Amino acid sequence: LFPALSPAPTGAPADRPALRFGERSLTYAELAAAAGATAGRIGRVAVWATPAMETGVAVVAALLAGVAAVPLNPKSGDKELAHILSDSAPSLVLAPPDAELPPALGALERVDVDVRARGAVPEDGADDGDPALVVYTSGTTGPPKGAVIPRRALATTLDALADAWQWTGEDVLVQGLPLFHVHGLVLGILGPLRRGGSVRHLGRFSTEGAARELNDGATMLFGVPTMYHRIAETLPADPELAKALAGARLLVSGSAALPVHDHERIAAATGRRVIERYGMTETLMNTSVRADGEPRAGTVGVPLPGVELRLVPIAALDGESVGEIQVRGPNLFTEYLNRPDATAAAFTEDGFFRTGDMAVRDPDGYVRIVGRKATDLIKSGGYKIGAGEIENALLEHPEVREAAVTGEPDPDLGERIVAWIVPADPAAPPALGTLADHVAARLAPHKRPRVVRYLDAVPR
Numbered sequence: 001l002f003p004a005l006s007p008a009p010t011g012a013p014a015d016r017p018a019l020r021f022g023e024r025s026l027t028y029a030e031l032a033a034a035a036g037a038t039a040g041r042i043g044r045v046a047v048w049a050t051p052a053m054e055t056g057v058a059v060v061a062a063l064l065a066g067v068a069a070v071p072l073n074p075k076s077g078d079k080e081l082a083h084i085l086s087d088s089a090p091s092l093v094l095a096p097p098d099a100e101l102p103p104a105l106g107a108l109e110r111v112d113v114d115v116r117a118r119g120a121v122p123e124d125g126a127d128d129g130d131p132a133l134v135v136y137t138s139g140t141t142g143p144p145k146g147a148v149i150p151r152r153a154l155a156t157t158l159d160a161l162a163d164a165w166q167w168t169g170e171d172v173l174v175q176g177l178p179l180f181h182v183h184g185l186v187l188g189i190l191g192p193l194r195r196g197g198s199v200r201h202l203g204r205f206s207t208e209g210a211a212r213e214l215n216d217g218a219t220m221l222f223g224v225p226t227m228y229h230r231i232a233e234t235l236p237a238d239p240e241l242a243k244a245l246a247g248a249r250l251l252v253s254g255s256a257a258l259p260v261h262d263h264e265r266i267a268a269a270t271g272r273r274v275i276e277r278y279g280m281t282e283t284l285m286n287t288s289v290r291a292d293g294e295p296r297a298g299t300v301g302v303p304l305p306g307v308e309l310r311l312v313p314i315a316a317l318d319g320e321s322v323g324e325i326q327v328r329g330p331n332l333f334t335e336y337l338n339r340p341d342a343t344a345a346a347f348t349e350d351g352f353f354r355t356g357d358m359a360v361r362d363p364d365g366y367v368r369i370v371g372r373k374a375t376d377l378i379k380s381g382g383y384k385i386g387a388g389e390i391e392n393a394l395l396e397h398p399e400v401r402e403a404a405v406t407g408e409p410d411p412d413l414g415e416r417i418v419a420w421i422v423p424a425d426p427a428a429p430p431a432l433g434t435l436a437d438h439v440a441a442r443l444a445p446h447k448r449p450r451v452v453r454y455l456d457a458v459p460r
């Protein structure tokens, strides 16, 4: 999976940079040795997945050990952690030494991840179908399902992207994405390691931080559309940001659609374009605009090598016939953990995954996502948010009789979460702050409502 880490590297390859988090870093040899020491201490494991160097070491340790990792959002609330802990039943939690863990984890064995530890890299005994990660992803109803992602899916999607993006071990990625989802963790940490390159993780994203790294040897930027919106807003005032983007080898957006107004403001300011790629937790990456392809706003390009894609079948490349994307390939997840009926429902009889995403293809083969088959989802900041679980949390509040949750457009977030409340007392309805704080404390801050509306009645 990482031939530059296992077996332990030697000579010049060993002293190449691997991970950089501000002034903290690890070379390939240092990462292999620190992850190896950790791997020997874990013969499923949870990872307290802060946007910090320890998270890279922890996940690489699990992969070297051949033990599935379950990334935890360090801002998850009590309900959300209890569910993941009960569902995935990890043996231990890998955490940074100084992390304050919440009481939901009080009974779990804590293994501190030491980035200065030096141990042997375990022998690789893993099989390609072995679970690599369990990544919790929201559905339209109920609590998040654990997508079990096999080792082979990681290798194949990362190598497919290497071909599409002309990504090599000479590339230096900058990113500031969360490390408990696929974009930040798989593409943004494991991808550079599989390639033999490096990543500079910003901790918290900022336009200034992205500019700094791209003006100082970073060659690629990955972000969600919200980050590109904030870049587009800042460009007129920020000459060094404009130069940073103009000089980049590749700018990539994903997790949600990049609006054409943001695309074109970036092109106006910098003279170059942002590649979009389309993927899902359950499928990893499906399509991308290629580095050697024509840049086309509002598209997600062509199927990646090894991905079988169809629209439903619609065979005309007409830019007009709307159909459901379905995919098959070694990029696919194994199952939803403990959910065999939901797993079976996600697949056609002949083994294609039903994405729910609606698309056309143009005469060049390019895919444009234009909607949904039956059921909108909510994407806020490039997080997929499930309405039903936000409703279920709001219903716990004593000032809420009934609740419905929807998304509405937001120029910065793509969509913002709306809470529709039948109050306990219509003359004293619960304020947004009380409801938002409650959902943040139960679920996670990114899932909080940003708007509240009161009604007499909501769907049952």
Ligand SMILES: Nc1ncnc2c1ncn2[C@@H]1O[C@H](COP(=O)(O)O)[C@@H](O)[C@H]1O
Binding pocket: 137, 253, 254, 255, 256, 257, 258, 276, 277, 278, 279, 280, 281, 282, 300, 355, 357, 369, 382, 383, 384
């Ligand atoms: N570049 C993109 N354009 C439009 N939608 C996207 C793109 N990348 C991912 N998505 C959406 O994100 C979903 C997967 O996100 P997730 O459920 O968080 O794994 C897909 O089903 C799409 O709806």
Ligand SMILES: [Cl-]
Binding pocket: 021, 024, 051, 052, 053, 054
């Ligand atoms: Cl750090």
Ligand SMILES: [Cl-]
Binding pocket: 073, 075, 076, 444, 445, 446, 447
């Ligand atoms: Cl959060």
Ligand SMILES: [Mg+2]
Binding pocket: 140, 141, 387, 388
């Ligand atoms: Mg619903």
